[PDB]
């Protein structure tokens, strides 16, 4: 997460004009990346000036301390100065591995001081010899990160719009695509079939939000502007009549000819560049002037290239993250539209919202990975970002030395923050609430938490084997949904305990328990199996 996903390329445009070179320059490109990160076992300052002696879990519990392991980071910073007349001055600095953060360490994990210690040593260290661990020690209390029940990624979930409120919509199909392992950031695409006949595709990720695009527009953004090719991509054949292909063809025609209010200028346009520009203008921030930038060819080129890179990284990333995989992405998107339109025919029923085949359980690692990426962004990158902006304010760009760069990088992560990765990680562990505000933004915490109530070891083990769906914002409204998600489902046997449930109140069926032999798998070697499948003579590739 720190190396591959946390790359920064931010450009600032000053107004400082106290030197001839300062007037000639109105731009600066801040660019840095980390290639070093390691969490080591918890440490404690015995007398505020010691050598950070080991911190044992009972010391953390007794003294209200946090059993957190320090985070050591090393970053490579590239500062590029941009002037007029095409000049480009670059300042490069390499930062020694520095530490301002600590990450909470689950008891019993390989970074816990009692990971491999003998049971007698645990007995005399103040720990439970027989307990397995799996909990966190934060501010004087023990916390368990539960198994958050999440829908399956890379799966098309199709549900009819049976909410009886705002019924201007018909069936909707969402597809959360993940580029790879658990920790890669997922981009969710939503395909909506409308009453007017339109089929709008909405992509929700970092760079996109609540923006609804007609399907043919996304298709012809990548070339293939011919309607024949798009209809062939959806229905897979325009030459076999059938009864299903007739319906899909006619309704795709209706969607194509529907006039949407927002994308009117580029709806009828067959020029790929114009559509790419329009979407880049609409979706990219920091571009307030819609006419000033157009008179500069290089600004247009920058916007187009950035938008194409974005769409490469955001539209179906699991299909690929390179421009050469865009046509197969179009094939996959046509397949998704075909599946939704098949389901419309009542040919297939909607996805079962409670069937466990389309559900995954994310525990500790995944939930903490997501919370950590958000918190690391907010409490590390933005401090560094503002520190470097102020540093450029204070000092001339070529006048910056190697030592000053490191001072501004490390110091920005120190003042007024000093622990905030640890404190925010602790807050995410303690709360686990399905509505939190980070930097004044209403986000959801996907970390299923639970206080460790040690009524008996059976209670502890059952708590660590608990699967929670954990209703988020826009929770269950008064419908059959609040009943069905609490019923024992026919897919439960063998994985979810059919018997275990709360017998009272709102929690009846809300919290599920793993069966006795059920286990949660980790991510496998996807690359090896994919290579074996591609080398299989019986499988014909997309190409």
């Amino acid at each position: 997460i720190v190396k591959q996903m946390f790359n920064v390329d931010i450009t600032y445009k000053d107004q400082r004009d106290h030197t001839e070179i300062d007037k000639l320059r109105e731009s600066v490109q801040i660019q840095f990346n980390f290639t070093d990160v390691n969490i080591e076992r918890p440490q404690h300052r015995n007398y505020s000036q010691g050598n950070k002696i080991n911190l044992l879990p009972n010391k953390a519990r007794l003294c209200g301390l946090s059993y957190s392991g320090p985070v050591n980071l090393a970053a490579e910073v590239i500062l590029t100065a941009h002037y007029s007349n095409g000049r480009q001055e670059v300042k490069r600095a390499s930062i020694p591995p520095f530490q301002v953060s600590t990450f909470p360490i689950m008891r019993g994990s390989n970074r816990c001081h009692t990971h491999h210690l003998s049971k007698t040593a645990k007995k005399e260290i103040g720990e439970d010899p027989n307990e397995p661990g799996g909990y966190f020690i934060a501010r004087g209390g023990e916390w368990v990160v539960d198994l958050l029940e999440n829908i399956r990624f890379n799966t098309l979930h199709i549900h009819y719009h049976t909410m009886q409120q705002g019924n201007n919509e018909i069936i909707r199909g969402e597809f959360i695509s993940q580029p790879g392992g658990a920790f890669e950031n997922s981009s969710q695409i939503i395909i909506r079939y409308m009453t007017t006949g339109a089929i709008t595709i909405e992509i929700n990720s970092t760079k996109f939000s609540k923006l609804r695009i007609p399907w043919y527009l996304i298709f012809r953004m990548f070339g293939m502007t011919g309607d024949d090719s798009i209809i062939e991509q959806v229905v897979f054949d325009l030459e076999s009549n059938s009864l299903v292909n007739t319906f899909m063809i006619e309704i795709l025609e209706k969607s194509i000819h529907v006039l949407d209010p927002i994308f009117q200028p580029v709806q009828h346009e067959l020029n790929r560049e114009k559509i790419i520009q329009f979407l880049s203008e609409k979706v990219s921030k920091f571009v307030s002037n819609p006419s000033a930038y157009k008179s500069d060819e290089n600004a247009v080129q920058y916007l187009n290239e950035r938008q194409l890179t974005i769409l490469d990284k955001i539209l179906l990333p699991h299909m690929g993250q390179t421009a050469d995989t865009r046509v197969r992405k179009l094939r996959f998107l046509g397949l998704l539209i075909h599946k939704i339109l098949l389901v419309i025919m009542n040919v297939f029923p909607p996805t079962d919202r409670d069937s466990y085949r389309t559900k995954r359980v994310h525990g500790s690692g995944v939930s903490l990975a997501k919370a950590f990426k958000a918190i690391f962004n907010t409490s590390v990158i933005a401090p560094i970002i503002n520190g470097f902006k102020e540093l450029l304010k204070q000092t001339a760009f070529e006048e910056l030395t190697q030592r000053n760069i490191i001072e501004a990088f490390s110091a920005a992560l120190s003042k007024n923050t000093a622990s905030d990765l640890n404190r925010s990680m602790e807050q995410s562990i303690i709360s686990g609430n399905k509505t939190i505000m980070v930097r004044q933004r209403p986000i959801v915490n996907r970390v299923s938490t639970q206080s460790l109530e040690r009524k008996n070891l059976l209670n502890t083990i059952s708590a660590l084997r608990t699967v929670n769906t954990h209703n988020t914002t826009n929770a269950s409204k008064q419908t059959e949904r609040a009943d069905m998600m609490r019923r024992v489902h026919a897919s439960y046997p063998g994985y979810i305990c059919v018997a275990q449930s709360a017998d009272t109140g709102e929690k009846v069926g809300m919290s599920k328990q793993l069966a006795i032999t059920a286990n949660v798998c980790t991510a496998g070697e996807v690359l090896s199996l994919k290579q074996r499948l591609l080398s299989d003579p019986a499988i014909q590739q997309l190409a």
Binding site: N46, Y47, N54, L56, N58, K59, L62, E124, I125, G126
Partner: peptide, 28 residues
């Protein structure tokens, strides 16, 4: 300073093994 060490668990382990050997008085 003592409150930082006396509540440190390895001191109890170090104390309890000194009591077994008899290097320190059994009580406090």
């Amino acid at each position: 300073l003592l409150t930082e060490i006396l509540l440190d668990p390895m001191y109890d382990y170090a104390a309890t093994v000194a009591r077994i050997d008899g290097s320190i008085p059994m009580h406090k």
